[PDB]
DNA sequence: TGCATCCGTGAGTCGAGGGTAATAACTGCTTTTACGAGCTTGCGAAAACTGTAAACGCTTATCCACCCGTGCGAT
């Protein structure tokens, strides 16, 4: 089994469990590998990062929880690896170039 | 020294059903008291509006250290 089949399984590993507290100590242990070694092979298969991409699906989930659900900004961050919305609102100007308040207005 | 008038006594719980009636003047005249009518203050409400330290949600400016963007290495 080549490693390009490993990371193909890893793209369906998280697509249901980004609302869960999913950390690297779960992803590495339930893959059969170590904590660091999964990140070296992750570059040569999809050209992007791993610890930011789980945020990139988490910040994708916050936008589809804002354009559909009435949940506030402060405690969507509580389930997605943040302890407050102060940093969680800040990276959204990097990921989608918008404010977490301004997305729901422009339809 | 009787004799004659007089004041003061006379069980206790309950009970039922209730309260009266005879008879008595008219007039003109003058002073006091009440009853409704109509105001005057004033007092408790409704409906607006001008001063402050927090007043509901929410962005940034920072600092920093867990983690690890990757590379290269461990047997």
Angle, helix A37-46 to helix A3-10, in steps of 10 degrees: 90
Identify the DSSP state of A33: S
Nearest Cα neighbor of A9 from A27, A35, A34, A29 is A27
Resolution (A): 3.4
Residues within a 7 A CB radius of strand B: A 24-25, 35-36, 39-40, 42-44, 48-52, 72-74, 85-86, 89-90, 93, 99-101
Local structure of A76: helix, strand or coil: helix
Experimental method: cryo-EM
Q: Output Rg (C-alpha) for chain A, integer angstroms.
A: 15
Q: Which nucleotide is nearest to A88 (CA to C1')?
A: B59
Identify the DSSP state of A68: S
């Amino acid at each position: 089994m080549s490693h390009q089949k490993i990371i193909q399984d890893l793209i369906a590993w998280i697509d249901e469990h980004i609302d869960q507290p999913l950390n690297i100590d779960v992803v590495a242990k339930k893959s059969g590998y170590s904590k660091w070694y999964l990140q070296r092979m992750f570059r040569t298969v999809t050209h992007q990062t791993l610890g930011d991409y789980i945020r990139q699906r988490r910040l994708l989930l916050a936008a589809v929880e804002l354009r559909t659900t009435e949940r506030p900004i402060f405690d969507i961050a509580m389930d997605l690896g943040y302890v407050s919305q102060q940093t969680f609102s800040r990276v959204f100007r990097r990921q989608f170039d918008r404010t977490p308040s301004d997305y729901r207005h422009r339809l």
